[PDB]
Amino acid sequence: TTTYDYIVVGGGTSGLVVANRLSENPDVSVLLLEAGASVFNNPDVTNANGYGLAFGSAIDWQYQSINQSYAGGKQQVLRAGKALGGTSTINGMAYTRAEDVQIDVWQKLGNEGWTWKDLLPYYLKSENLTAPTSSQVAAGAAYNPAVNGKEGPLKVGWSGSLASGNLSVALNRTFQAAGVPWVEDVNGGKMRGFNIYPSTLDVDLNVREDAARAYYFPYDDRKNLHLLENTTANRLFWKNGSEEAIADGVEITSADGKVTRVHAKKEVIISAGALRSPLILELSGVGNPTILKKNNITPRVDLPTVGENLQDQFNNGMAGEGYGVLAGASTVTYPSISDVFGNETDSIVASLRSQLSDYAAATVKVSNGHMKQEDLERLYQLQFDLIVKDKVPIAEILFHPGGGNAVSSEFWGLLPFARGNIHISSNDPTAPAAINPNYFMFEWDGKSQAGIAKYIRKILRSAPLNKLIAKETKPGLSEIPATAADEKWVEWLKANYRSNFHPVGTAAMMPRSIGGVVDNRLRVYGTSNVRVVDASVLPFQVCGHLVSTLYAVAERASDLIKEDAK
Numbered sequence: 147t148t149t150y151d152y153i154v155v156g157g158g159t160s161g162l163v164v165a166n167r168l169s170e171n172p173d174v175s176v177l178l179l180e181a182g183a184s185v186f187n188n189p190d191v192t193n194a195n196g197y198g199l200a201f202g203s204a205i206d207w208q209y210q211s212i213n214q215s216y217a218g219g220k221q222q223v224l225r226a227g228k229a230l231g232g233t234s235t236i237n238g239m240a241y242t243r244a245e246d247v248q249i250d251v252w253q254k255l256g257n258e259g260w261t262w263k264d265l266l267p268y269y270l271k272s273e274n275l276t277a278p279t280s281s282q283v284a285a286g287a288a289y290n291p292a293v294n295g296k297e298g299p300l301k302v303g304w305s306g307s308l309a310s311g312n313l314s315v316a317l318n319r320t321f322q323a324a325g326v327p328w329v330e331d332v333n334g335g336k337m338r339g340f341n342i343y344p345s346t347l348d349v350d351l352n353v354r355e356d357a358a359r360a361y362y363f364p365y366d367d368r369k370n371l372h373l374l375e376n377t378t379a380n381r382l383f384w385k386n387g388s389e390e391a392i393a394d395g396v397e398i399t400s401a402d403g404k405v406t407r408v409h410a411k412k413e414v415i416i417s418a419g420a421l422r423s424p425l426i427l428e429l430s431g432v433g434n435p436t437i438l439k440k441n442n443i444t445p446r447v448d449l450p451t452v453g454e455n456l457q458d459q460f461n462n463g464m465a466g467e468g469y470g471v472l473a474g475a476s477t478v479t480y481p482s483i484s485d486v487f488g489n490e491t492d493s494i495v496a497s498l499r500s501q502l503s504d505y506a507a508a509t510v511k512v513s514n515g516h517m518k519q520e521d522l523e524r525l526y527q528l529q530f531d532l533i534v535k536d537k538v539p540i541a542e543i544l545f546h547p548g549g550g551n552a553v554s555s556e557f558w559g560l561l562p563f564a565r566g567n568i569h570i571s572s573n574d575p576t577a578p579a580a581i582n583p584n585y586f587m588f589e590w591d592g593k594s595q596a597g598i599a600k601y602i603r604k605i606l607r608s609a610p611l612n613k614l615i616a617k618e619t620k621p622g623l624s625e626i627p628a629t630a631a632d633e634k635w636v637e638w639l640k641a642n643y644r645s646n647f648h649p650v651g652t653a654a655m656m657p658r659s660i661g662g663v664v665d666n667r668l669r670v671y672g673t674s675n676v677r678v679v680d681a682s683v684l685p686f687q688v689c690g691h692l693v694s695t696l697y698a699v700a701e702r703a704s705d706l707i708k709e710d711a712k
């Protein structure tokens with residue numbers, strides 16, 4: 147058989163959810179196309195303490211950006227999983243969600259049916275939380291039962307290794323003294339605070355719970371669910387007509403290099419990730435006709451914001467050294483703008499407010515005018531209001547024991563304003579795309595990252611944590627003296643950042659009139675039966691780690707797809 151009801155392109159975090167849910171109807175056939183293969187036995191993947199091992203290996207796509215001209219000019223890797231399970235197989239396993247009001251903004255933008263209350267049941271539907279044991283509670287693990295699922299495919303919990311220790315106790319106390327409270331659960335729509343966050347972990351087996359272990363392997367003997375692993379989707383092909391486009395199927399390349407077709411009777415769902423789904427649309431003739439014709443593609447749908455509105459965060463690290471060994475829980479802190487900036491908040495806010503229209507005008511040029519000034523101003527206003535009025539967190543700060551006397555912190559500004567893009571460089575599906583996130587394009591983006599770095603320096607010096615810490619080692623005071631200007635902080639951050647690997651927005655869910663690529667049922671404009679369901683569709687960044695929200699989005703999409711089939 148090479149004809150199926152649905153073809154899901156990309157057996158990753160989001161694609162496996164859609165394939166799982168659509169195959170619950172035994173009369174519906176579902177084909178998954180995945181470029182990689184199983185990592186059920188890959189020790190870099192299964193190890194619950196293995197984050198980083200897979201970097202640069204054969205299961206890391208290692209996509210490369212262009213030289214980042216606003217960030218001191220180097221290329222950056224954008225990592226992504228090439229595996230059944232996608233990027234959930236190589237990620238840091240943290241499970242945190244979003245601010246309620248920031249999901250509500252999706253409807254404010256024009257996406258009917260996308261609010262926190264609409265998404266919440268789908269976060270619960272995805273999740274099977276293992277409650278913390280008494281020793282884990284003593285370590286600071288907590289949850290709110292009303293906002294965690296107990297029955298879903300994705301196991302979430304805390305390491306059996308979790309123990310209370312000097313470092314996490316001191317951090318808890320130090321943040322409390324700085325006015326940032328310990329919160330029991332960051333996944334109930336209000337994320338501000340200090341928390342011992344849960345992970346995507348099977349606590350029983352002590353193994354990473356990736357999307358394939360959650361949504362594929364326990365279901366793999368469904369006779370209506372088919373997998374073509376080691377298989378790359380090149381492009382969609384269409385029914386005749388030159389009318390709203392009807393996808394007939396997907397053109398594929400097998401491991402032996404042979405090009406063939408598989409056919410879809412109902413819909414093609416594209417879940418190849420934010421750095422591939424827009425490329426697959428372009429190769430199919432759906433995108434900016436000038437780019438398509440330059441690259442020898444016949445345009446089928448004039449939708450020039452395919453690949454535009456790319457938004458990513460950037461990550462920096464700091465470190466300190468204890469007088470002696472440091473231990474305890476890994477902690478996350480989600481500070482607001484006023485937590486980070488204290489007395490300077492009002493002037494930071496006023497500078498930011500004064501730059502929004504300038505940011506918008508600069509971003510218009512990034513898409514050569516396929517986003518309008520007024521639309522970018524409205525988008526940037528919504529983001530500004532979340533930061534300033536709703537006080538959503540502006541940073542994620544991770545602290546954990548780094549081994550021996552080391553304390554490591556990793557941090558990122560959550561809501562930079564820079565937008566960039568991704569586009570094909572050829573019609574050859576193997577050619578590397580031109581990927582440009584435009585890191586540090588706007589003043590707020592580097593100024594907030596510097597505020598965050600300074601805040602971490604201050605926390606390490608604050609009581610009672612300061613009684614445990616002998617010195618800051620990264621950057622340290624030789625590199626960045628106590629009185630260093632913001633410019634010196636920004637320069638160091640630019641020299642040392644990486645992508646945070648949270649790209650969104652390249653097939654953004656917005657009304658077509660304001661630049662969207664998909665409607666509120668994730669259907670690509672100009673097509674009858676093509677959807678994108680993965681990070682590409684998020685119209686803005688979120689505060690937490692992506693998988694929780696991608697699973698919830700894919701769960702919700704699955705219900706929308708089923709409703710449309712009835």
Ligand SMILES: Cc1cc2c(cc1C)N(C[C@H](O)[C@H](O)[C@H](O)COP(=O)(O)OP(=O)(O)OC[C@H]1O[C@@H](n3cnc4c(N)ncnc43)[C@H](O)[C@@H]1O)c1[nH]c(=O)[nH]c(=O)c1N2
Binds near residue numbers: 239682691
């Ligand atoms: C290093 C690192 C660390 C983190 C994270 C990312 C990374 C890279 N993230 C982010 C999160 O893991 C990520 O955003 C999602 O897994 C992305 O899910 P998607 O479904 O969008 O794409 P995803 O990349 O999962 O899936 C796309 C699938 O499509 C396949 N594919 C691509 N092109 C194809 C083609 N042409 N044909 C066939 N198949 C194709 C890919 O191989 C892949 O399996 C994270 N999140 C989190 O919640 N907690 C965390 O701690 C972290 N930490």
Ligand SMILES: O=C1O[C@H](CO)[C@@H](O)[C@H](O)[C@H]1O
Binds near residue numbers: 238648
């Ligand atoms: O959990 C994590 O996710 C972050 C991205 O979500 C990544 O940058 C950190 O290195 C990692 O610890």
